[PDB]
Structures are given as C-alpha cells and as structure tokens.
Design a protein around this ligand. Structure first.
Ligand SMILES: Nc1ncnc2c1nc(Br)n2[C@@H]1O[C@H](CO)[C@@H](O)[C@H]1O
Ligand SMILES: [Mg+2]
Length: 390
C-alpha cells in the first residue's frame, strides 16, 4: 500500500557547534556522533589527502590553522564589503577572498589552492549532521528543518537553504533559533491566549536575547537585542590572563610567547570553566607547561565569578533593551528559556533569575541542544500528510 516514511531531522546549524535531533516514539532523540558527542564542531579542515569535518577537523586545528575553516555562519549571505565581514577577517587564520563582492574562504586542498563559498562550507557541516542521523536511524535521511538566527535577512536564509540543497537535503523550512527553542518546551501548545517568551542565548562568541509572542501556536518576533562581543571565549580569556599572571608570580617566567603553552593553558581553562558549573572549585594540572615546569594549581568558582563579573553582569543590558523595544515589563514575561552551553554558569543563571524576581528558568532541555530539539519536533509535524475522516 504505502511504504513507511523515513524520519525527518532537525538541525541546529550553529556558528561554533551544530546539533541534530529526530522526533520518534513521541519524543526527541538528540543524536551523538561516532566520537560520542551530542554536538559537533562546525569546522572543516583540508589537507593534501583528506577533507575532515567536525571533531576530526577541530582536533587538528593547532598545526593546520590556515586550512581549517570555522565561523562560516558569520560570512553566509553577506557581501565581502559588509563592515561585519571586514572586522571578523582580522581574527581568522584562514584566508577570505573577494569574488564579485562575495566572500570565499581560500585553502590548500589535495595539491591545489581552492576557494569555497560560505554555503559550500556549511553544506559540508550539514553532510556530517545528515550522516550522524543516518548512522543512528540505519537508513538514508532526505528531509530536514534547519534553524537560523531571528535577525537573518532573506539572503542569509536563502544561502542556508542553498547549503542544505548542496548537502542533498530537502529543506522543509528555515525556522528561527528562538522559535525552535520555544517549540522544544511546547510553548506553542499551551492553547488560546498570548504568552510572552524571552529566549536568553549565550554562545561561544555572541549573546542574543529574543522576545516572542505566541498566540494560538502563532509566533511573532517582538524584539531582538544582544552583544556581538560577549560569549564563552571571553570567560576562557579571563582565566588565561589570570593563570599567565599566576605562573609569573610563582615561577618568575612569562609563558605568553609560546603558542603551545598558551594553547594548552586555554584548553585546560575551558575544561576547568565547565567543571566550575557543577563544582565549587576545580584543579588545573598541566605537565611541562613551560621550561619543563609542571603547572599544578586550582581555582575556586568564587574567583572565576570575580574574574568574569563585569561580563556576566553585562548580559542584563540587552535584556533591558529588548524589554523596552517589545514595550514590556519584566513581570509580563511568562516564560524564560536558556540556550547555549554558557548558560550552565550558575552565576549567569542567578543574575537573570534575580533580574526576573526569582522566576524559574526553563533549562531542563540541555541548552546546547534545545534549538535542534525544537527543529526535530517541527520536522516531524511538517512531514505529516493525514487525510480527514468523514
Ligand atoms: N557546562 C558548561 N559550563 C560553562 N560553559 C560551558 C559548559 N558547556 C559548554 Br558547551 N560551555 C561553553 O559553551 C560554549 C559553546 O560554544 C563554549 O564557550 C563552552 O566552553
Ligand atoms: Mg545556537
């Protein structure tokens, strides 16, 4: 009669990390990749012999910075002359070239110089997310919902669809990331009446606040605000500067000019930062960090909180701005939703909860997974083809 239909997938195509989910048996499964990771780095690396995507690309970045591409989402659908592009290029070790006022990333790959459009790099990330899903489902996947930031314009949305098409995916719909996080919590399934929802999205490099109004399952974006210069990497930087100073005090040595030592320090700082979200202190243990000196130390959650105190407080400025733009008072927000791994920081949670006079934060769906979760819920809804009974 009618053959069983393959599941459709939800993909959060993130700036730094991507995530894939599938809605089956009345629930979402966020799919781990073959290294056991529930999120995959949005990285693509090029060598003389291979094209590596995800963890394999990020894990070899230290010695191949010129040919390992990341942050293509910051270039997608933008003109080469866009001031955002021009500023971002100064921070990237890979080459960005001008092709008819359209940026392309240029690398050494399989014996040649090759340039790729941002949508081609994103299609490579989407191919890896599709393969992650197919390894779990055990059959080919065709249909997907892909998410984008609410502030993406028509060109940025079309370039994201183009990336899905290059990857061999049928793009069911491009949906906003804050909308997908709200869908993950069923905030569009609460019946008749208006609900005001604030999405608090703190990423690796950027911070976004969105205010949505939901009325009978219909979403309206009421206000967006944020800080392009606020993310998890800024907290890592504060710990790096702190430990560089500590090594100077303790051993009378400045490590800051050995890239390997700085990199090993930063990698350790990011893990210590994650431990501090669950524990009140964390050890830092690096063997032969510089001049054969073992660096065995610790940091309390209180000291880390003091180090990033101004940065954590600054998340409340875009919250207040978004509320003024939406013409709403904080008491009028019905639901608060946390998105991004950096939102696990207890002090970040406390500052926001205190701002909203003790209100509960929706954080039960892993914040680095909520967007893919909502996208998977929507993908299953979009492929339904029920014919009405008489
Ligand atoms: N448990 C956690 N506590 C604090 N931070 C975290 C945690 N988990 C993740 Br993931 N992060 C950070 O989220 C960002 C995602 O690009 C990176 O800066 C990660 O370091
Ligand atoms: Mg995100």
């Amino acid at each position: 009669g009618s053959m069983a239909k393959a599941a459709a997938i939800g993909i959060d195509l993130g700036t730094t990390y991507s995530c894939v989910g599938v809605f089956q048996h009345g629930k979402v499964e966020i799919i781990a990749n073959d290294q056991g990771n529930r999120t995959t780095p949005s990285y693509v690396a090029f060598t003389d012999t291979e094209r590596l995507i995800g963890d394999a690309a990020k894990n070899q970045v230290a010695l191949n910075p010129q040919n390992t591409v990341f942050d293509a989402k910051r270039l997608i659908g933008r003109k080469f002359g866009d001031p955002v592009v021009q500023s971002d290029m100064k921070h990237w070790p890979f080459q960005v070239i001008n092709d008819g006022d359209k940026p392309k990333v240029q690398v050494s790959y399989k014996g040649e110089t090759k340039a790729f459009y941002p949508e081609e790099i994103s299609s490579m990330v989407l191919t890896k997310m599709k393969e992650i899903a197919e390894a779990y489902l055990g059959y080919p996947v065709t249909n997907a919902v892909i998410t984008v930031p609410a502030y993406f314009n028509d060109s940025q949305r079309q370039a994201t669809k183009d990336a899905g098409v290059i990857a061999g995916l049928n793009v069911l719909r491009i949906i906003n990331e804050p909308t997908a996080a709200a869908i993950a919590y069923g905030l569009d399934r609460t019946g008749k009446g208006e609900r005001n929802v604030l999405i608090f999205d703190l990423g690796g490099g950027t911070f976004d606040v969105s205010i949505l109004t939901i009325d009978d399952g219909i979403f309206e974006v009421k206000a967006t605000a944020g800080d392009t210069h606020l993310g998890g990497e800024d907290f890592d930087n504060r710990l790096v500067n702190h430990f560089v100073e500590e090594f100077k005090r303790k051993h009378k040595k400045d490590i800051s000019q050995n890239k390997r030592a700085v990199r090993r320090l930063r990698t350790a700082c990011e893990r210590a930062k994650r431990t501090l979200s669950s524990s009140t202190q964390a050890s830092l243990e690096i063997d032969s960090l510089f001049e054969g000196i073992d660096f065995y130390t610790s940091i309390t959650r209180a000291r880390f909180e003091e180090l990033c105190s101004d940065l954590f407080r600054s998340t409340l400025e875009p919250v207040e701005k978004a509320l003024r733009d939406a013409k709403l008072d904080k008491a009028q927000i019905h639901d608060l939703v946390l998105v991004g791994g950096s939102t696990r920081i207890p002090k970040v949670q406390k500052l926001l909860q205190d701002f909203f006079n003790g209100r509960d934060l929706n954080k039960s769906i892993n914040p680095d997974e909520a967007v893919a979760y909502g996208a998977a819920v929507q993908a299953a809804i979009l492929i339904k083809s029920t014919r009405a009974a008489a």
